[PDB]
Design a protein around this ligand. Structure first.
Ligand SMILES: Cc1cc2nc3c(=O)[nH]c(=O)nc-3n(C[C@H](O)[C@H](O)[C@H](O)COP(=O)(O)OP(=O)(O)OC[C@H]3O[C@@H](n4cnc5c(N)ncnc54)[C@H](O)[C@@H]3O)c2cc1C
Ligand SMILES: O=C(c1ccc(OCCN2CCCCC2)cc1)c1c(-c2ccc(O)cc2)sc2cc(O)ccc12
Ligand SMILES: O=C(c1ccc(OCCN2CCCCC2)cc1)c1c(-c2ccc(O)cc2)sc2cc(O)ccc12
Ligand SMILES: Nc1nc2c(c(=O)[nH]1)N[C@H]1C(S)=C(S)[C@@H](COP(=O)(O)O)O[C@H]1N2
Ligand SMILES: Nc1nc2c(c(=O)[nH]1)N[C@H]1C(S)=C(S)[C@@H](COP(=O)(O)O)O[C@H]1N2
Ligand code: MOS
Ligand code: MOS
Ligand code: FES
Ligand code: FES
Lengths: 1295, 99, 50, 50
């Protein structure tokens, strides 16, 4: 009966007969046509859907603004509220908001997909805090993710609210004339209506009571219905775990649920309070009350602030947190040990129960009754001699679920120092939060000494036991964290007891004190150094020109592929993927799915007949699985329906019967054990290693594993295919790196000539090599659907299915035997490279080639033999990635150099210096190189970073601290650039000069955030001597520039720039007679004169490509055109008790040549470095013994956030040298900085060595260096004490 | 090209020209339409010369392409246009031309 | 370079789809840009001849 | 199957434009009243030379 009334961007929205299942994110984009708000993951973690929610409290007559993730907001919960998107605060056709202007002008956007979420998070904070600190701004962005920029320029834009850009020219912020809260909402809030609002559909009924009495009545009539508050727990489980509720109760601002009572014994917080409100209440109480009373609140205040981001904290409710009872909850273990009671209520009456272990285990005798609600929670004041602590460890510092957390409390007898009460609770170690009540009971009566600590450790280990098959994995790591937190709690209590009662307790050891300080630094600093006489002022080459779409990124006006409007009668396609790693497809049942609403068609391999395959490289491979599946995520069915919601529902009722097949291969060593078929070997051979091994002083053999990496482009796989209706013409709009490849595979699948299929790309929201191969397979299947049914078809993948269908970076296994002198000179190297290829091998044999050709890095190995193989496994087939084998192969080489350094007793940096290439030298493939800039980059990085001084300070720190170690390392970089053939490097362009003087330019390159279109217009502005505002570019299309190569290989700007330069010079040659006759004329005058004299004003630009060749039989050739040189120094500090680590400072010097755009190029170094840093540290993919990719809980994939960025970041570009072969003596970077992230890897390796060396343990750390790997390498009494399982007695959660 | 199809058959005649100049069947050629984004500064489609002038321009582009490729056809005279085009790409020969 | 015109085919013109066509297109485009919408303009035979 | 201009599919949220033409061959425009026309269903805007 009720209508839904709310405001978006100041305009009223009325919906009659609303579908209660409608969510805000699809509503904004498809109903209101406000596509600025993006989809990133749909789980509340990325923040690309960040919007602002405004409500007017009629009791306090105050307007409240708070951020929220639109993907988790049901629109039925917005009645009487006001939503604000990116488009609401500013636009290019109205007025740019300062937040939009600065994040763009500070180069805080690259691909721009995450910018709308960044803008709204910053804007929402400025409305609450117009004069904020940097800490407040960085906290607001804690739940915002970016894959492109490295966060540094976004923080520079945040700092302006408290060089590469003119800060003094920015529009001033005016806190007045901001957006006015809609007056009507204030009026209906003043009319405090008591009517319960009702919405419904065939599937769902939604009740929104506004009084407490009505809430209790609906809790009684529908006991099994959930009480939705923030939907941050029920939302995700509905979306990902198939949970459905036919009736939903969602109360609206009930006062009794938001009570904040400051009692005498304790304080009571209502269940309707958000976690952000509770964080602010507790932060105020700990200041107004004595410290002995605020023990419980300090512990809650600690884990609040690392809990998710600002958006989720403002959405999630306190009562929802307690009732949800997540095992990884960070607050429930603290509340479990604090004698907290739950104030319940029902139509019956009041009721009070304790928040204990039985409640958290969902025992019905200690749970809520079905008809009851949680009103508020009592958290008591602490007594004197009562102490509470909270601990946790996750994959990264913030916005990541805890692997293990804990809450502990002690109460001491005043006159004996004896433990009177003790309660220890752990989370993330079972299905629910547990309490070690038995071990605690046995410790009652003891004193606080090391003898009690040893007994406590053995006791809890017995009680809080995990099986080797425990979900979440990391079993031994979890066991160590349980007693490591107990050790920290022991030291915390030991220090306050010594402070309060000095005569009864001993002093802490000086080396032990650092364990009490936690690693943190929300303070960020950075410096940028670049170059700059007789160049024309209007020449933009070399100037830090902003990305052309920068402002359009910040206003949400940039159109990405899914942002395109609904074309008439278009359909949606979704895929049913494989759930088995290697099995027979016994049967497929589509009968039910075909009969469900909206379903137009469902296709299998048989429905595509003879176009189910396509020859990508060496052999023809299938789009859809036929009779077998060879990995999970393999495409089996394609569901075509009238809407996305109907297509996904239908795909889930498709029944597929499997029969598992042997063998099931997952690892590289398994692939070697079972592969007895011929495999193309590839080898480089320099010198004579078999003879060199006879002269060497020492010989070592080592190996290192290295995991893969997900691209995690913020824009998922997206495409819209549209039939013209004539001659089977197909327009295919795709987020791809390879329009020519999309054209080939679509036309081949449709049995059409290439002139009938055209691919158009305006911009890509990040790709990093992940939008090529599988993108064409999807595009081919979508286009087959479109042509078959005479309809346009849209296909957009969700984050979960995107990570399964598409591949990732190739995992690597490096095996080396090194022969070296006592001084560190590696005179013999016998290297072996193995790549986990997945189901297919075509992409992998090229990454093995590039790995061999670049494994030398910056070192002259006089006698070297390298070999490489690609290995099939029953995993998603991996694709190309930023670096193309170099981040793997070079990490193998640096790992060998580090092992050589340990044997000979020198720092790895001293071994790197003596093994480095000389100024003139030769590569293993017999290419002469000039390594002056390599030596220079190393020299200036040592001077800029003050390495020798810091090296002494780190050793001094490690000598005075035991449970905390700092680490330092520097690595050099030689990234060669070359595609292997001349034809692969050709590029083309098309330039028009219209009679008004304006210019339209297009080329084969793709804009994925690297700013190639900006550089192309920088070229036109110079070559034709006109301002950049006189030239425009629309996008990339096979209809304008044909036969364009892939947008990859670090040369997109290089080659298309030379082609654009070629077209401009052709036009200038034609116009030189006119220009000389009228030199004071404008381009409008010259163009009209050329038309009058019948001079063509259109020209095709073309570059043939760099010369390149490689003879793999001889192992020689000239494959690379130039070399990008550099060096990076990183300093870290690690927590030896938890595996946590903090990136303190990173210094980078880079040989870029003559930078065409320093702002774009420096941003390419930052993004590549951060992307590499995650590859070597926190980014981790976990697969089960059945080959299933795990994606829930602590297994969630974590890309670097703001907290992961180094505290200090210095970047310098080397003063330029001459590179006449390339465009304007520039060097194509952006792939090179990825390897420089391993400087953080070997800085952690340095700190781990310092702890092991001090402790007398005389090392193979694999990548990624997770907190799990860091903690276990720091062996101590705890790692030696934990129980362990025999290797084959259990089937583990991860391999 | 810059000409407009009003029913006079200019697009049919244009593909008749390409079929002769490149020595290929008309079914191997396709035209989508007319746009200022592909061919700029085109004159009015009128004056009884639309097929005349755009025919000479289309003929000019075809002859430019046939000159570039001539070393490749003479090396493989028995080949198809698919063979000649792929060989031109492998030898870095531009396959786009403004007439 | 910001405005592009695309024509696939014309159902007869005989010189009658030039001048006034641009005037209608200019006024239509002014409406489209002002309101941020695509605008369609098709004349009936009576108002066409006039 | 040949697509003429008006045959192009309905693009999202597109509007329609029609013209009020002159009913006099040579006259003064003393006044124009749009008040009723602006208030009628579907009307988004009405443009004059001003
Ligand atoms: C991206 C993300 C990151 C997260 N990170 C963390 C983290 O780092 N640490 C952590 O500890 N947690 C984390 N969480 C979990 C989060 O804290 C909880 O999901 C949230 O607190 C639940 O509150 P809610 O209001 O969203 O509950 P809802 O989803 O609205 O409801 C959940 C349950 O609570 C019940 N309920 C709610 N209110 C009442 C009431 N008054 N009476 C009875 N039953 C009630 C509902 O019926 C339902 O059963 C994260 C969640 C997300 C989505
Ligand atoms: O009773 C003691 C106590 C007893 C003996 C002590 O020995 C002092 C040092 N001693 C000297 C002789 C050789 C061995 C070490 C200290 C405190 C109390 C405590 C204690 C602390 C640590 C520990 O390991 C054992 C006990 S704490 C305390 C608080 C009180 O109010 C009263 C007594 C106490
Ligand atoms: O550049 C190529 C490529 C070039 C030549 C190839 O082989 C030439 C033979 N030809 C292949 C297509 C079918 C007909 C025979 C194969 C791939 C890449 C691709 C391609 C291009 C066109 C096409 O139709 C299918 C795949 S996919 C790809 C991914 C990379 O990481 C690098 C290069 C590439
Ligand atoms: N913002 C952004 N930068 C990026 C990428 C991307 O997807 N987004 N891809 C990288 C990859 S894989 C390559 S090969 C280069 C390609 O463009 P370039 O040759 O002009 O650097 O951009 C790099 N930088
Ligand atoms: N079917 C058809 N034929 C037509 C016209 C037309 O509109 N429709 N226009 C005529 C006019 S006005 C001219 S100037 C010429 C233009 O095309 P042509 O130069 O190729 O003959 O076509 C003529 N024939
Ligand atoms: O060469 Mo970058 O597209 S993997
Ligand atoms: O010459 Mo015909 O366009 S009037
Ligand atoms: S946070 Fe909602 S889409 Fe990512
Ligand atoms: S610019 Fe932030 S995700 Fe690409």
């Amino acid at each position: 009966a009720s209508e839904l009334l709310f405001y978006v961007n100041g305009r009223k929205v009325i919906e009659k007969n609303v579908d209660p299942e409608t969510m805000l994110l699809p509503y904004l984009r498809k109903k209101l046509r406000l596509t600025g708000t993006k989809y990133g993951c749909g789980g509340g973690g990325c923040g690309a859907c960040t919007v602002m929610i405004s409500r007017y409290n009629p009791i306090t007559k105050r307007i409240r603004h708070h951020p929220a993730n639109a993907c988790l907001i049901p629109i039925c919960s917005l009645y009487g509220a006001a939503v604000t998107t990116v488009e609401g605060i500013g636009s290019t056709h109205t007025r740019i908001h300062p937040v939009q202007e600065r994040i763009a002008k500070c180069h805080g956007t690259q691909c721009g997909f995450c910018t709308p979420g960044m803008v709204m998070s910053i804007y929402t904070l400025l409305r609450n805090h117009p004069e904020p600190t940097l800490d407040q701004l960085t906290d607001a962005l804690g739940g915002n993710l970016c894959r492109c920029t490295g966060y540094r320029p976004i923080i520079d834009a945040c700092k302006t609210f408290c060089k590469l850009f003119a800060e003094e020219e920015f529009l001033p912020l005016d806190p007045t004339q901001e957006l006015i809260f809609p007056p009507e909402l204030m009026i209906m809030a003043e009319k405090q209506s008591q009517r319960t609002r009702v919405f419904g559909s065939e599937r769902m009924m939604w009740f929104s009571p506004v009084t407490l009495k009505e809430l209790l009545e609906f809790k009684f009539k529908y006991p099994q219905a959930p009480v939705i508050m923030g939907n941050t727990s029920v939302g995700p489980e509905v979306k990902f775990k198939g949970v459905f509720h036919p009736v939903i109760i969602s109360p609206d601002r009930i006062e009794e649920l938001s009570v904040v009572n400051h009692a005498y014994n304790g304080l009571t917080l209502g269940a309707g309070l958000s976690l952000a409100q509770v964080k602010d209440i507790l932060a105020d109480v700990v200041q107004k009350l004595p410290e002995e009373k605020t023990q419980m609140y300090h512990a809650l205040l600690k884990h609040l602030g690392t809990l998710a981001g600002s958006q989720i904290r403002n959405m999630a409710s306190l009562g929802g947190h307690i009732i949800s009872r997540h095992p990884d909850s960070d607050l429930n273990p603290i509340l479990a040990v604090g004698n907290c009671t739950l104030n319940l209520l029902s139509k019956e009456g009041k009721r009070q129960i304790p928040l204990n272990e039985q409640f958290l285990s969902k025992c019905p005798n200690a749970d809520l009754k079905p008809q009851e609600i949680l009103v508020s929670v009592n958290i008591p004041y602490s007594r004197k001699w009562e102490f509470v602590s909270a601990f946790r460890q996750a994959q990264r510092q913030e916005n990541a679920l805890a692997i293990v957390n804990s809450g502990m409390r002690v109460f001491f007898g005043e006159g004996d120092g004896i433990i009177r009460e003790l309660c220890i609770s752990y989370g993330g170690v079972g299905p629910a939060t547990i309490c070690a009540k038995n071990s605690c009971q046995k410790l009652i009566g003891r004193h606080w000494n090391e003898q009690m600590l040893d007994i406590a450790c053995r006791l809890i280990l017995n009680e809080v036991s995990l099986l080797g098959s425990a979900p979440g994995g990391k079993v031994e790591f979890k066991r160590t964290l349980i007693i490591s937190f107990l050790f920290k709690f022991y030291l915390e209590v030991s220090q306050i007891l010594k402070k309060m009662d000095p005569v009864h307790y001993p002093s802490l050891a000086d080396k032990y004190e650092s364990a009490l300080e936690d690693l943190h630094s929300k303070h960020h600093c950075s410096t940028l150094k670049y170059q700059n006489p007789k160049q024309h002022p209007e020449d933009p080459i070399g100037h830090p020109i902003m990305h052309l779409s920068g402002v359009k990124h910040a206003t949400g006006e940039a159109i990405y592929c899914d942002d395109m409007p609904l074309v008439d009668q278009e359909l949606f396609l979704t895929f049913v993927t494989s759930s088995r790693a290697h099995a027979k497809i016994v049967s497929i049942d589509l009968s039910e799915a075909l009969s469900m609403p909206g379903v137009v068609d469902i296709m299998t391999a048989e429905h595509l007949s003879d176009v189910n395959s396509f020859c990508f490289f060496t052999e023809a491979e299938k789009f859809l699985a036929t009779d077998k599946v060879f990995c999970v995520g393999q495409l089996v069915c394609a569901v075509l329906a009238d809407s996305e919601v109907q297509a996904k529902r239908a795909a889930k009722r498709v029944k597929i019967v499997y029969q598992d097949l042997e063998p099931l291969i997952l690892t590289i060593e398994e692939s070697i054990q079972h592969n007895s078929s011929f495999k193309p070997e590839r080898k480089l051979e320099y010198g004579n290693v078999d003879e060199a091994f006879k002269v060497v002083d020492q010989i070592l053999e080592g190996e290192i594993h290295m995991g893969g990496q997900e691209h995690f482009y913020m824009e998922t796989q997206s495409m819209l295919v549209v039939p013209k209706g004539e001659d089977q013409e197909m327009d295919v709009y795709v987020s791809t790196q390879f329009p020519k490849y999309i054209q080939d595979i679509v036309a081949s699948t449709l049995k059409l000539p290439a002139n009938k299929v055209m691919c158009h790309v305006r911009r890509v929201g990040g790709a990093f090599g992940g939008k090529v191969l599988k993108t064409g397979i999807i595009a081919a299947v979508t286009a087959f659907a479109a042509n078959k049914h005479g309809r346009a078809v849209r296909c957009v993948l969700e984050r979960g299915e995107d990570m399964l269908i598409t591949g990732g970076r190739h995992p690597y296994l490096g095996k080396y035997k090194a022969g070296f002198m006592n001084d560190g000179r590696i005179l013999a190297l016998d290297m072996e490279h193995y790549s986990n290829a997945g189901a297919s091998l075509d992409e992998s044999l090229f990454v093995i080639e590039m790995g061999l050709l670049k494994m030398d890095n910056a070192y002259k190995f006089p006698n070297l033999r390298c070999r490489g193989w690609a290995c099939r496994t029953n995993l998603p087939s991996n694709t190309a990635f930023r670096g193309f084998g170099f981040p793997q192969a070079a990490l193998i080489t640096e790992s060998c150099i580090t092992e050589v350094a340990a044997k000979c007793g020198l720092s790895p940096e001293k071994v790197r210096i003596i093994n480095m290439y000389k100024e003139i030298d030769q590569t293993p493939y017999k290419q002469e190189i000039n390594a002056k800039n390599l030596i220079q980059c190393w020299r200036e990085c040592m001077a800029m970073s003050s390495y020798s001084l810091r090296k002494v300070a780190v050793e001094k720190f490690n000598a005075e601290n035991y449970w905390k170690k700092k680490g330092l390392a520097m690595v050099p970089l030689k990234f060669p650039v070359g595609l292997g053939s001349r034809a692969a490097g050709q590029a083309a362009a098309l330039v028009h000069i219209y009679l008004d003087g304006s210019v339209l330019v297009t080329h084969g390159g793709i804009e994925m955030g690297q700013g190639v279109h900006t550089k192309m217009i920088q070229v036109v502005s110079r070559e034709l001597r006109m301002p950049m505002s006189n030239v425009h570019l629309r996008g990339t299309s096979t209809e304008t520039v044909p036969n364009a190569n892939i947008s990859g290989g670090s040369v997109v700007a290089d080659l298309n720039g030379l082609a654009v330069k070629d077209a401009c010079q052709t036009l200038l040659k034609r116009l030189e007679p006119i220009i000389s006759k009228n030199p004071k004329g404008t381009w409008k005058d010259w163009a009209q004169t050329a038309f009058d004299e019948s001079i063509n004003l259109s020209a095709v630009g073309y570059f043939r490509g760099y010369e390149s060749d490689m003879n793999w039989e001889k192992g020689e050739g000239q494959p690379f055109e130039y070399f990008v040189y550099g060096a990076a120094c990183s300093e870290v500090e690690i927590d030896c008790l938890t595996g946590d680590h903090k990136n303190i400072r990173t210094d980078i010097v880079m040989d870029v040549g003559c930078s065409i755009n320093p702002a774009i190029d420096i941003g390419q170094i930052e993004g590549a470095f951060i992307q590499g840093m995650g590859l070597y540290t926190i980014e981790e993919l976990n697969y089960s013994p059945q080959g299933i990719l795990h994606t829930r809980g602590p297994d969630q994939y974590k890309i670097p956030a703001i907290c992961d960025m180094p505290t200090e970041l210095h970047i310098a570009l080397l003063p330029p040298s001459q590179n006449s072969n390339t465009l304007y003596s520039s060097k194509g970077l952006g792939e090179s900085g990825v390897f420089l992230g391993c400087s953080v890897f070997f800085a952690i390796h340095d700190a781990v060595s310092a702890a092991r060396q001090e402790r007398g343990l005389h090392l193979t750390l694999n990548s990624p260096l997770t907190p799990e790997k860091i903690r276990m390498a720091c062996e101590d009494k705890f790692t030696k004490m934990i129980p362990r399982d025999e290797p084959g007695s259990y089937v583990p959660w991860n391999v």
